[PDB]
PDB file of C-alpha atoms and ligand atoms in Angstrom:
ATOM      1  CA  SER A   6     -59.377 -73.340  11.810  1.00 36.51           C
ATOM      2  CA  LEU A   7     -58.387 -75.844   9.054  1.00 39.03           C
ATOM      3  CA  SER A   8     -61.549 -77.979   9.228  1.00 37.45           C
ATOM      4  CA  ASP A   9     -63.949 -75.001   9.073  1.00 34.75           C
ATOM      5  CA  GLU A  10     -62.147 -74.036   5.655  1.00 33.24           C
ATOM      6  CA  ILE A  11     -62.351 -77.717   4.269  1.00 30.18           C
ATOM      7  CA  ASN A  12     -66.171 -77.945   5.366  1.00 31.95           C
ATOM      8  CA  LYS A  13     -66.787 -74.601   3.628  1.00 31.04           C
ATOM      9  CA  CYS A  14     -64.790 -75.416   0.395  1.00 31.21           C
ATOM     10  CA  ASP A  15     -66.884 -78.859   0.260  1.00 33.72           C
ATOM     11  CA  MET A  16     -69.983 -76.775   0.567  1.00 34.53           C
ATOM     12  CA  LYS A  17     -69.517 -73.636  -1.654  1.00 34.08           C
ATOM     13  CA  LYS A  18     -72.377 -73.248  -4.312  1.00 35.34           C
ATOM     14  CA  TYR A  19     -71.397 -69.560  -5.481  1.00 33.23           C
ATOM     15  CA  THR A  20     -68.396 -67.600  -5.988  1.00 33.45           C
ATOM     16  CA  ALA A  21     -68.069 -63.631  -6.021  1.00 33.51           C
ATOM     17  CA  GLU A  22     -66.798 -63.884  -9.722  1.00 30.41           C
ATOM     18  CA  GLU A  23     -70.033 -65.961 -10.765  1.00 31.92           C
ATOM     19  CA  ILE A  24     -72.264 -63.450  -9.167  1.00 30.79           C
ATOM     20  CA  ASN A  25     -70.631 -60.273 -10.621  1.00 30.57           C
ATOM     21  CA  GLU A  26     -70.498 -62.118 -13.985  1.00 33.63           C
ATOM     22  CA  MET A  27     -74.307 -62.763 -13.630  1.00 32.86           C
ATOM     23  CA  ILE A  28     -75.062 -59.215 -12.551  1.00 32.85           C
ATOM     24  CA  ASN A  29     -72.872 -57.693 -15.288  1.00 34.22           C
ATOM     25  CA  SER A  30     -74.138 -60.145 -18.127  1.00 32.22           C
ATOM     26  CA  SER A  31     -75.054 -58.483 -21.334  1.00 32.73           C
ATOM     27  CA  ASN A  32     -78.135 -60.644 -21.517  1.00 31.25           C
ATOM     28  CA  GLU A  33     -81.327 -58.480 -21.533  1.00 32.36           C
ATOM     29  CA  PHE A  34     -83.263 -60.657 -19.249  1.00 31.48           C
ATOM     30  CA  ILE A  35     -82.490 -62.711 -16.173  1.00 30.32           C
ATOM     31  CA  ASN A  36     -84.494 -65.803 -15.108  1.00 29.74           C
ATOM     32  CA  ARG A  37     -85.651 -66.780 -11.587  1.00 31.75           C
ATOM     33  CA  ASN A  38     -83.030 -69.398 -11.030  1.00 28.75           C
ATOM     34  CA  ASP A  39     -80.188 -66.641 -11.597  1.00 27.26           C
ATOM     35  CA  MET A  40     -82.192 -64.095  -9.342  1.00 33.07           C
ATOM     36  CA  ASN A  41     -82.464 -66.728  -6.623  1.00 35.80           C
ATOM     37  CA  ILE A  42     -78.645 -67.645  -6.883  1.00 37.30           C
ATOM     38  CA  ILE A  43     -77.666 -63.945  -6.524  1.00 37.89           C
ATOM     39  CA  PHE A  44     -80.277 -63.257  -3.730  1.00 37.81           C
ATOM     40  CA  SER A  45     -78.818 -66.276  -1.727  1.00 37.55           C
ATOM     41  CA  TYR A  46     -75.412 -65.133  -2.137  1.00 40.68           C
ATOM     42  CA  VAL A  47     -76.406 -61.570  -1.001  1.00 40.92           C
ATOM     43  CA  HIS A  48     -78.578 -62.874   1.875  1.00 40.45           C
ATOM     44  CA  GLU A  49     -75.332 -64.801   3.129  1.00 43.10           C
ATOM     45  CA  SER A  50     -72.874 -61.962   2.450  1.00 42.78           C
ATOM     46  CA  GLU A  51     -75.066 -59.458   4.547  1.00 42.17           C
ATOM     47  CA  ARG A  52     -75.421 -62.118   7.211  1.00 43.32           C
ATOM     48  CA  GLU A  53     -71.736 -62.455   7.653  1.00 43.35           C
ATOM     49  CA  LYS A  54     -71.056 -58.831   7.530  1.00 43.33           C
ATOM     50  CA  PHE A  55     -73.676 -58.158  10.137  1.00 41.13           C
ATOM     51  CA  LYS A  56     -71.927 -60.614  12.453  1.00 41.48           C
ATOM     52  CA  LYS A  57     -68.499 -58.718  12.059  1.00 39.24           C
ATOM     53  CA  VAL A  58     -70.314 -55.492  12.953  1.00 40.79           C
ATOM     54  CA  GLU A  59     -71.710 -57.134  16.236  1.00 42.02           C
ATOM     55  CA  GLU A  60     -68.132 -58.413  17.047  1.00 46.60           C
ATOM     56  CA  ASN A  61     -66.686 -54.920  16.749  1.00 46.33           C
ATOM     57  CA  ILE A  62     -69.349 -53.541  18.923  1.00 46.27           C
ATOM     58  CA  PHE A  63     -68.720 -56.334  21.618  1.00 46.69           C
ATOM     59  CA  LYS A  64     -64.783 -55.614  21.261  1.00 46.39           C
ATOM     60  CA  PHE A  65     -65.346 -51.990  21.945  1.00 43.86           C
ATOM     61  CA  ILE A  66     -67.473 -52.661  24.945  1.00 41.51           C
ATOM     62  CA  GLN A  67     -64.794 -54.943  26.254  1.00 40.09           C
ATOM     63  CA  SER A  68     -62.580 -51.979  26.829  1.00 41.50           C
ATOM     64  CA  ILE A  69     -65.252 -50.403  29.251  1.00 40.83           C
ATOM     65  CA  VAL A  70     -65.835 -53.801  30.834  1.00 39.58           C
ATOM     66  CA  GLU A  71     -62.005 -53.974  31.731  1.00 41.25           C
ATOM     67  CA  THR A  72     -61.858 -50.487  32.740  1.00 43.62           C
ATOM     68  CA  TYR A  73     -64.466 -50.854  35.275  1.00 45.21           C
ATOM     69  CA  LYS A  74     -63.774 -54.483  36.088  1.00 42.84           C
ATOM     70  CA  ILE A  75     -67.568 -55.291  35.111  1.00 40.38           C
ATOM     71  CA  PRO A  76     -68.565 -58.998  35.956  1.00 41.24           C
ATOM     72  CA  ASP A  77     -68.924 -61.447  32.926  1.00 40.49           C
ATOM     73  CA  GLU A  78     -72.521 -62.190  34.466  1.00 37.88           C
ATOM     74  CA  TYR A  79     -73.584 -58.719  33.751  1.00 37.63           C
ATOM     75  CA  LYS A  80     -71.614 -58.328  30.420  1.00 38.76           C
ATOM     76  CA  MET A  81     -72.983 -61.689  28.746  1.00 42.69           C
ATOM     77  CA  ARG A  82     -76.601 -61.084  29.836  1.00 37.93           C
ATOM     78  CA  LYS A  83     -76.384 -57.542  28.219  1.00 37.41           C
ATOM     79  CA  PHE A  84     -74.597 -58.809  25.276  1.00 38.94           C
ATOM     80  CA  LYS A  85     -77.168 -61.512  24.751  1.00 38.86           C
ATOM     81  CA  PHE A  86     -80.304 -59.054  24.839  1.00 41.16           C
ATOM     82  CA  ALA A  87     -78.356 -56.568  22.558  1.00 40.39           C
ATOM     83  CA  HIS A  88     -77.794 -59.361  20.005  1.00 37.50           C
ATOM     84  CA  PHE A  89     -81.557 -60.107  19.961  1.00 36.88           C
ATOM     85  CA  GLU A  90     -82.523 -56.335  19.347  1.00 36.13           C
ATOM     86  CA  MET A  91     -79.905 -56.078  16.478  1.00 35.94           C
ATOM     87  CA  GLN A  92     -81.460 -59.209  14.844  1.00 39.46           C
ATOM     88  CA  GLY A  93     -84.953 -57.551  15.213  1.00 39.01           C
ATOM     89  CA  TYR A  94     -83.702 -54.420  13.485  1.00 41.92           C
ATOM     90  CA  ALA A  95     -81.934 -56.443  10.793  1.00 44.14           C
ATOM     91  CA  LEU A  96     -85.190 -58.509  10.305  1.00 45.42           C
ATOM     92  CA  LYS A  97     -87.232 -55.314   9.849  1.00 43.29           C
ATOM     93  CA  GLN A  98     -84.574 -53.847   7.230  1.00 40.38           C
ATOM     94  CA  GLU A  99     -84.677 -57.118   5.230  1.00 42.32           C
ATOM     95  CA  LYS A 100     -88.717 -57.154   5.253  1.00 44.24           C
ATOM     96  CA  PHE A 101     -88.761 -53.684   3.909  1.00 44.33           C
ATOM     97  CA  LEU A 102     -86.010 -54.555   1.147  1.00 46.07           C
ATOM     98  CA  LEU A 103     -87.912 -57.894   0.281  1.00 45.99           C
ATOM     99  CA  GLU A 104     -91.211 -55.804  -0.201  1.00 50.27           C
ATOM    100  CA  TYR A 105     -89.106 -53.190  -2.244  1.00 52.14           C
ATOM    101  CA  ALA A 106     -87.541 -55.978  -4.488  1.00 52.93           C
ATOM    102  CA  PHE A 107     -90.937 -57.828  -4.881  1.00 53.49           C
ATOM    103  CA  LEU A 108     -92.753 -54.605  -6.058  1.00 52.28           C
ATOM    104  CA  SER A 109     -89.830 -53.438  -8.303  1.00 52.32           C
ATOM    105  CA  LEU A 110     -89.282 -56.685 -10.200  1.00 53.78           C
ATOM    106  CA  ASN A 111     -92.943 -57.732 -10.895  1.00 53.23           C
ATOM    107  CA  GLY A 112     -96.148 -56.288 -12.495  1.00 54.35           C
ATOM    108  CA  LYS A 113     -98.927 -54.449 -10.543  1.00 53.86           C
ATOM    109  CA  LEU A 114    -101.073 -57.679 -10.246  1.00 56.34           C
ATOM    110  CA  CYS A 115    -100.614 -61.392  -9.068  1.00 60.77           C
ATOM    111  CA  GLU A 116    -102.928 -64.361  -9.431  1.00 59.11           C
ATOM    112  CA  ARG A 117    -105.195 -64.582  -6.289  1.00 60.09           C
ATOM    113  CA  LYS A 118    -105.061 -68.469  -6.356  1.00 57.74           C
ATOM    114  CA  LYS A 119    -101.175 -68.310  -6.077  1.00 54.52           C
ATOM    115  CA  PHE A 120    -101.441 -65.552  -3.264  1.00 51.78           C
ATOM    116  CA  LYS A 121    -104.019 -67.666  -1.423  1.00 50.88           C
ATOM    117  CA  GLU A 122    -101.729 -70.790  -1.665  1.00 50.07           C
ATOM    118  CA  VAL A 123     -98.597 -69.004  -0.401  1.00 50.53           C
ATOM    119  CA  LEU A 124    -100.891 -67.525   2.562  1.00 49.70           C
ATOM    120  CA  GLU A 125    -102.316 -71.068   3.410  1.00 53.40           C
ATOM    121  CA  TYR A 126     -98.677 -72.443   3.608  1.00 55.77           C
ATOM    122  CA  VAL A 127     -97.647 -69.401   5.817  1.00 55.08           C
ATOM    123  CA  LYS A 128    -100.479 -69.950   8.292  1.00 56.20           C
ATOM    124  CA  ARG A 129     -99.808 -73.728   8.378  1.00 55.37           C
ATOM    125  CA  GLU A 130     -96.129 -73.224   9.022  1.00 54.60           C
ATOM    126  CA  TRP A 131     -96.988 -70.703  11.918  1.00 56.03           C
ATOM    127  CA  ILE A 132     -99.282 -73.356  13.607  1.00 59.63           C
ATOM    128  CA  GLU A 133     -96.442 -76.103  13.309  1.00 61.04           C
ATOM    129  CA  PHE A 134     -93.822 -73.341  14.609  1.00 62.02           C
ATOM    130  CA  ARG A 135     -96.175 -72.707  17.559  1.00 63.76           C
ATOM    131  CA  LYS A 136     -96.707 -76.318  18.610  1.00 65.65           C
ATOM    132  CA  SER A 137     -92.833 -77.134  18.386  1.00 63.93           C
ATOM    133  CA  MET A 138     -92.091 -73.772  20.462  1.00 65.53           C
ATOM    134  CA  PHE A 139     -94.650 -74.927  23.236  1.00 62.88           C
ATOM    135  CA  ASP A 140     -93.087 -78.495  23.613  1.00 62.55           C
ATOM    136  CA  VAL A 141     -89.587 -77.328  23.262  1.00 61.98           C
ATOM    137  CA  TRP A 142     -89.576 -74.304  25.761  1.00 57.97           C
ATOM    138  CA  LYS A 143     -91.940 -76.164  28.268  1.00 59.84           C
ATOM    139  CA  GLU A 144     -89.353 -78.817  28.638  1.00 61.49           C
ATOM    140  CA  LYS A 145     -86.340 -76.471  28.442  1.00 58.25           C
ATOM    141  CA  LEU A 146     -87.685 -74.303  31.171  1.00 59.32           C
ATOM    142  CA  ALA A 147     -89.263 -77.258  33.259  1.00 61.68           C
ATOM    143  CA  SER A 148     -85.841 -78.889  33.572  1.00 61.44           C
ATOM    144  CA  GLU A 149     -84.140 -75.770  34.406  1.00 64.42           C
ATOM    145  CA  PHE A 150     -86.605 -74.667  37.108  1.00 63.19           C
ATOM    146  CA  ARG A 151     -87.125 -78.232  38.529  1.00 60.90           C
ATOM    147  CA  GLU A 152     -83.345 -78.550  38.964  1.00 61.95           C
ATOM    148  CA  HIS A 153     -82.719 -75.168  40.425  1.00 64.01           C
ATOM    149  CA  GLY A 154     -85.679 -76.060  42.919  1.00 63.77           C
ATOM    150  CA  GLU A 155     -84.047 -79.306  43.901  1.00 64.27           C
ATOM    151  CA  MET A 156     -80.789 -77.292  44.523  1.00 65.24           C
ATOM    152  CA  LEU A 157     -82.694 -74.804  46.864  1.00 64.00           C
ATOM    153  CA  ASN A 158     -84.473 -77.674  48.622  1.00 62.20           C
ATOM    154  CA  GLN A 159     -80.904 -79.088  49.291  1.00 66.04           C
ATOM    155  CA  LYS A 160     -79.313 -75.806  50.739  1.00 67.84           C
ATOM    156  CA  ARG A 161     -82.731 -75.376  52.845  1.00 66.60           C
ATOM    157  CA  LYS A 162     -82.450 -79.028  54.191  1.00 64.74           C
ATOM    158  CA  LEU A 163     -78.905 -78.575  55.031  1.00 63.70           C
ATOM    159  CA  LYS A 164     -79.741 -75.511  57.339  1.00 63.83           C
TER     160      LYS A 164
ATOM    161  CA  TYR B  19    -108.350 -53.664   9.923  1.00 66.61           C
ATOM    162  CA  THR B  20    -111.201 -56.131  10.765  1.00 69.89           C
ATOM    163  CA  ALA B  21    -111.118 -59.925  10.634  1.00 67.79           C
ATOM    164  CA  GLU B  22    -114.216 -59.588   8.358  1.00 68.59           C
ATOM    165  CA  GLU B  23    -112.617 -57.153   5.938  1.00 71.10           C
ATOM    166  CA  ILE B  24    -109.373 -59.427   5.447  1.00 73.17           C
ATOM    167  CA  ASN B  25    -111.624 -62.632   5.018  1.00 69.71           C
ATOM    168  CA  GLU B  26    -113.671 -60.571   2.343  1.00 72.58           C
ATOM    169  CA  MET B  27    -110.451 -59.557   0.487  1.00 74.43           C
ATOM    170  CA  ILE B  28    -108.996 -63.087   0.518  1.00 75.35           C
ATOM    171  CA  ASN B  29    -112.338 -64.641  -0.612  1.00 76.72           C
ATOM    172  CA  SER B  30    -112.903 -61.871  -3.348  1.00 79.57           C
ATOM    173  CA  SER B  31    -114.263 -63.176  -6.580  1.00 80.81           C
ATOM    174  CA  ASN B  32    -111.578 -60.845  -8.356  1.00 82.08           C
ATOM    175  CA  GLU B  33    -109.152 -62.899 -10.398  1.00 82.52           C
ATOM    176  CA  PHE B  34    -106.106 -60.667  -9.538  1.00 82.80           C
ATOM    177  CA  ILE B  35    -105.032 -58.897  -6.235  1.00 84.46           C
ATOM    178  CA  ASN B  36    -103.184 -55.449  -6.153  1.00 84.56           C
ATOM    179  CA  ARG B  37    -100.307 -54.305  -3.646  1.00 80.54           C
ATOM    180  CA  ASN B  38    -102.767 -52.346  -1.299  1.00 79.34           C
ATOM    181  CA  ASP B  39    -104.607 -55.361  -0.588  1.00 78.01           C
ATOM    182  CA  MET B  40    -101.602 -57.662  -0.696  1.00 80.71           C
ATOM    183  CA  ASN B  41     -99.649 -55.734   1.971  1.00 78.68           C
ATOM    184  CA  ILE B  42    -102.958 -55.040   4.173  1.00 75.67           C
ATOM    185  CA  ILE B  43    -103.347 -58.875   4.243  1.00 72.07           C
ATOM    186  CA  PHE B  44     -99.691 -59.647   5.170  1.00 70.58           C
ATOM    187  CA  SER B  45     -99.803 -56.859   7.807  1.00 70.85           C
ATOM    188  CA  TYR B  46    -102.959 -58.535   9.533  1.00 71.82           C
ATOM    189  CA  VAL B  47    -101.310 -61.958   9.150  1.00 73.63           C
ATOM    190  CA  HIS B  48     -97.979 -60.861  10.746  1.00 74.33           C
ATOM    191  CA  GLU B  49    -100.014 -58.981  13.548  1.00 76.42           C
ATOM    192  CA  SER B  50    -102.110 -62.210  14.011  1.00 76.66           C
ATOM    193  CA  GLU B  51     -99.388 -64.610  14.329  1.00 78.14           C
ATOM    194  CA  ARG B  52     -97.481 -61.955  16.696  1.00 76.44           C
ATOM    195  CA  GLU B  53    -100.567 -62.243  18.994  1.00 75.30           C
ATOM    196  CA  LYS B  54    -100.873 -66.059  18.679  1.00 76.59           C
ATOM    197  CA  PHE B  55     -97.072 -66.432  19.582  1.00 77.30           C
ATOM    198  CA  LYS B  56     -97.627 -64.350  22.853  1.00 78.64           C
ATOM    199  CA  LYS B  57    -100.337 -66.753  23.938  1.00 80.87           C
ATOM    200  CA  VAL B  58     -97.958 -69.823  23.587  1.00 82.02           C
ATOM    201  CA  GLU B  59     -95.524 -67.881  25.838  1.00 83.29           C
ATOM    202  CA  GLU B  60     -98.094 -67.119  28.404  1.00 82.45           C
ATOM    203  CA  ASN B  61     -99.076 -70.971  28.520  1.00 83.56           C
ATOM    204  CA  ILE B  62     -95.321 -71.992  28.980  1.00 79.54           C
ATOM    205  CA  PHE B  63     -94.875 -69.274  31.750  1.00 78.90           C
ATOM    206  CA  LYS B  64     -98.400 -70.575  33.313  1.00 75.67           C
ATOM    207  CA  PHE B  65     -97.016 -74.121  33.355  1.00 78.88           C
ATOM    208  CA  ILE B  66     -93.562 -73.111  34.858  1.00 79.03           C
ATOM    209  CA  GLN B  67     -95.614 -71.049  37.584  1.00 79.96           C
ATOM    210  CA  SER B  68     -96.778 -74.548  38.857  1.00 75.82           C
ATOM    211  CA  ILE B  69     -92.930 -75.573  39.477  1.00 76.22           C
ATOM    212  CA  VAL B  70     -92.223 -72.108  40.895  1.00 74.56           C
ATOM    213  CA  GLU B  71     -94.813 -72.692  43.579  1.00 76.56           C
ATOM    214  CA  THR B  72     -93.971 -76.380  44.196  1.00 77.67           C
ATOM    215  CA  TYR B  73     -90.168 -75.600  44.874  1.00 79.14           C
ATOM    216  CA  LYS B  74     -91.005 -71.956  46.357  1.00 81.94           C
ATOM    217  CA  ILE B  75     -88.530 -70.631  43.695  1.00 81.10           C
ATOM    218  CA  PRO B  76     -88.012 -66.653  44.359  1.00 85.41           C
ATOM    219  CA  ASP B  77     -89.409 -64.265  41.835  1.00 86.65           C
ATOM    220  CA  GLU B  78     -86.149 -62.730  41.191  1.00 84.52           C
ATOM    221  CA  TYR B  79     -84.887 -65.984  39.554  1.00 85.98           C
ATOM    222  CA  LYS B  80     -88.241 -66.658  37.888  1.00 86.02           C
ATOM    223  CA  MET B  81     -88.411 -63.257  36.159  1.00 86.76           C
ATOM    224  CA  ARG B  82     -84.749 -63.140  35.089  1.00 86.54           C
ATOM    225  CA  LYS B  83     -85.341 -66.768  33.481  1.00 86.85           C
ATOM    226  CA  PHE B  84     -88.525 -65.691  31.900  1.00 86.62           C
ATOM    227  CA  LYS B  85     -87.026 -62.544  30.442  1.00 87.67           C
ATOM    228  CA  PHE B  86     -84.170 -64.393  28.666  1.00 84.17           C
ATOM    229  CA  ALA B  87     -86.458 -67.322  27.428  1.00 82.31           C
ATOM    230  CA  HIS B  88     -88.663 -64.657  26.087  1.00 83.03           C
ATOM    231  CA  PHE B  89     -85.835 -63.187  23.811  1.00 81.28           C
ATOM    232  CA  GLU B  90     -84.802 -66.813  22.858  1.00 80.10           C
ATOM    233  CA  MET B  91     -88.298 -67.679  21.698  1.00 79.49           C
ATOM    234  CA  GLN B  92     -88.828 -64.231  20.053  1.00 78.60           C
ATOM    235  CA  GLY B  93     -85.413 -64.801  18.360  1.00 76.96           C
ATOM    236  CA  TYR B  94     -86.624 -68.072  16.857  1.00 76.60           C
ATOM    237  CA  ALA B  95     -89.929 -66.421  15.852  1.00 74.58           C
ATOM    238  CA  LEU B  96     -88.205 -63.647  14.081  1.00 75.77           C
ATOM    239  CA  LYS B  97     -85.998 -66.222  12.208  1.00 75.25           C
ATOM    240  CA  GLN B  98     -89.282 -68.089  11.190  1.00 76.07           C
ATOM    241  CA  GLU B  99     -90.957 -64.890   9.879  1.00 74.89           C
ATOM    242  CA  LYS B 100     -87.617 -63.984   8.003  1.00 78.21           C
ATOM    243  CA  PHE B 101     -87.818 -67.594   6.264  1.00 78.56           C
ATOM    244  CA  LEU B 102     -91.534 -67.206   5.535  1.00 78.74           C
ATOM    245  CA  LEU B 103     -91.033 -63.664   4.231  1.00 80.38           C
ATOM    246  CA  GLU B 104     -88.329 -65.134   1.879  1.00 76.37           C
ATOM    247  CA  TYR B 105     -90.608 -68.149   0.931  1.00 76.69           C
ATOM    248  CA  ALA B 106     -93.466 -65.625  -0.012  1.00 78.20           C
ATOM    249  CA  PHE B 107     -90.963 -63.478  -2.061  1.00 76.14           C
ATOM    250  CA  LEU B 108     -89.358 -66.400  -4.104  1.00 78.37           C
ATOM    251  CA  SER B 109     -92.789 -68.080  -4.693  1.00 79.79           C
ATOM    252  CA  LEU B 110     -94.692 -65.002  -5.994  1.00 81.86           C
ATOM    253  CA  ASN B 111     -91.742 -63.466  -8.088  1.00 78.45           C
ATOM    254  CA  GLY B 112     -91.950 -64.102 -11.909  1.00 78.05           C
ATOM    255  CA  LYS B 113     -89.915 -66.496 -13.965  1.00 77.17           C
ATOM    256  CA  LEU B 114     -88.219 -63.557 -15.992  1.00 77.55           C
ATOM    257  CA  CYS B 115     -87.136 -60.005 -15.381  1.00 79.16           C
ATOM    258  CA  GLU B 116     -85.155 -57.403 -17.299  1.00 76.96           C
ATOM    259  CA  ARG B 117     -81.441 -57.579 -16.132  1.00 80.16           C
ATOM    260  CA  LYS B 118     -81.169 -53.674 -16.148  1.00 77.25           C
ATOM    261  CA  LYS B 119     -84.078 -53.289 -13.436  1.00 77.35           C
ATOM    262  CA  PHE B 120     -82.678 -56.521 -11.519  1.00 78.87           C
ATOM    263  CA  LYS B 121     -79.389 -54.796 -11.408  1.00 76.55           C
ATOM    264  CA  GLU B 122     -81.012 -51.473 -10.344  1.00 69.83           C
ATOM    265  CA  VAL B 123     -82.813 -53.083  -7.310  1.00 72.20           C
ATOM    266  CA  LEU B 124     -79.603 -55.013  -6.368  1.00 71.65           C
ATOM    267  CA  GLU B 125     -77.372 -51.861  -6.198  1.00 71.86           C
ATOM    268  CA  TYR B 126     -80.250 -50.328  -3.870  1.00 72.80           C
ATOM    269  CA  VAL B 127     -80.381 -53.311  -1.514  1.00 71.13           C
ATOM    270  CA  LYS B 128     -76.419 -53.176  -1.295  1.00 71.86           C
ATOM    271  CA  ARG B 129     -76.355 -49.297  -0.437  1.00 71.74           C
ATOM    272  CA  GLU B 130     -79.304 -49.701   2.039  1.00 69.70           C
ATOM    273  CA  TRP B 131     -77.200 -52.640   3.747  1.00 68.35           C
ATOM    274  CA  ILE B 132     -74.175 -50.580   3.906  1.00 68.98           C
ATOM    275  CA  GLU B 133     -76.068 -47.620   5.462  1.00 68.45           C
ATOM    276  CA  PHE B 134     -77.817 -49.906   7.894  1.00 65.22           C
ATOM    277  CA  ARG B 135     -74.489 -51.481   8.999  1.00 60.76           C
ATOM    278  CA  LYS B 136     -72.903 -48.129   9.569  1.00 59.73           C
ATOM    279  CA  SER B 137     -75.842 -46.984  11.579  1.00 60.49           C
ATOM    280  CA  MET B 138     -76.153 -50.159  13.565  1.00 55.84           C
ATOM    281  CA  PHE B 139     -72.459 -49.911  14.465  1.00 55.03           C
ATOM    282  CA  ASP B 140     -72.614 -46.342  15.904  1.00 55.95           C
ATOM    283  CA  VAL B 141     -76.292 -46.733  17.494  1.00 58.59           C
ATOM    284  CA  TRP B 142     -75.516 -50.054  19.418  1.00 60.27           C
ATOM    285  CA  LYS B 143     -71.876 -48.691  20.478  1.00 56.35           C
ATOM    286  CA  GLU B 144     -73.724 -45.778  22.001  1.00 60.46           C
ATOM    287  CA  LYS B 145     -76.644 -47.604  23.696  1.00 59.22           C
ATOM    288  CA  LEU B 146     -74.173 -50.190  25.280  1.00 62.88           C
ATOM    289  CA  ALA B 147     -71.456 -47.754  25.994  1.00 60.59           C
ATOM    290  CA  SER B 148     -73.750 -45.535  28.065  1.00 60.43           C
ATOM    291  CA  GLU B 149     -75.382 -48.698  29.780  1.00 60.74           C
ATOM    292  CA  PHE B 150     -71.898 -50.176  30.698  1.00 60.09           C
ATOM    293  CA  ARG B 151     -70.145 -46.966  31.669  1.00 59.72           C
ATOM    294  CA  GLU B 152     -73.072 -46.128  33.940  1.00 59.12           C
ATOM    295  CA  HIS B 153     -73.069 -49.533  35.440  1.00 61.71           C
ATOM    296  CA  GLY B 154     -69.400 -49.513  35.810  1.00 60.73           C
ATOM    297  CA  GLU B 155     -69.280 -45.996  37.340  1.00 59.28           C
ATOM    298  CA  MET B 156     -71.937 -47.139  40.017  1.00 59.45           C
ATOM    299  CA  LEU B 157     -69.816 -50.095  40.785  1.00 60.71           C
ATOM    300  CA  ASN B 158     -66.653 -48.177  41.567  1.00 59.99           C
ATOM    301  CA  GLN B 159     -68.886 -45.770  43.886  1.00 57.48           C
ATOM    302  CA  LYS B 160     -70.421 -48.839  45.600  1.00 57.48           C
ATOM    303  CA  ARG B 161     -66.849 -50.444  46.029  1.00 56.82           C
ATOM    304  CA  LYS B 162     -65.327 -47.077  47.477  1.00 58.40           C
ATOM    305  CA  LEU B 163     -68.418 -46.763  49.921  1.00 56.76           C
ATOM    306  CA  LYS B 164     -67.759 -50.478  51.389  1.00 57.83           C
ATOM    307  CA  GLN B 165     -64.075 -49.838  51.367  1.00 58.84           C
ATOM    308  CA  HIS B 166     -64.304 -46.583  53.285  1.00 60.43           C
ATOM    309  CA  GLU B 167     -66.299 -48.654  55.681  1.00 56.66           C
TER     310      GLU B 167
HETATM  311 CL1  LIG C   1     -72.907 -56.911  37.872  1.00 57.61          CL
HETATM  312 CL1  LIG C   2     -82.568 -58.301   1.665  1.00 52.87          CL
HETATM  313 CL1  LIG C   3     -96.538 -60.528  -9.399  1.00 52.77          CL
HETATM  314 CL1  LIG C   4     -88.905 -57.137  27.899  1.00 52.85          CL
HETATM  315 CL1  LIG C   5     -94.707 -63.676   7.765  1.00 53.68          CL
HETATM  316 CL1  LIG C   6     -93.007 -60.416  -0.302  1.00 54.79          CL
END
């Protein structure tokens, strides 16, 4: 749609031409800003292309769904869990490539102080993530189960 | 890998840290956060068990909803790990790099992603095709069985 194009044009930070220009620059060295811009563009490009692969898989499985008149309940539940498994494999691939890029672009050593700072931030963010997850999912499932339980009691009272 | 070994490594008097240690610490930390996440899920599920018993909700509904919630939570946990891996990569990477070397790394990352995408397409077409074709065939057979009364 039109609004999706306007919202994207109004948000664009990088072009493909800019990125190719940066990659192909005659400059012997490349600074952290330019490296971050390129990795942000690449992360985004790989994220979009991955989604197109998932669409193509789901379009293909749709042909089997229609051949065997498979109900939507089964189709959507299986598509949902497959999406999760594919995300899982993509994270594992990105993890290896981030480690590859980290070791290839830097020296053998890093300041222990800086490493300890990053590590303390990761640990604090995980505690914060876990607290939030507890509160969010406890409420999501409580409402869903309490509601379904009220619906059952209704059907039970009727009989 | 012990909790004493990793605390010893982080608290080392050594001014710098090598790859071997940095990876052995991030592996231990990824594992520790993975265990701690599972404890949060258990706590949620224990709480929902109280509502299950209050309304006498059947196990079939309970387990199916717990399975789906698990995958949604793990989905958010993978996204959180991805952000924190990216955070650590950008924070520890140096201010300058030889452009030649950067271009080489970038060309490798791009080729690996093309290879990943080709493989993923094929692998997941096969996993879901077999699963759906099998479920479909069993549905037709169950339908013919009821229709032949
Ligand atoms: Cl079904
Ligand atoms: Cl990557
Ligand atoms: Cl470094
Ligand atoms: Cl499972
Ligand atoms: Cl992490
Ligand atoms: Cl890293």
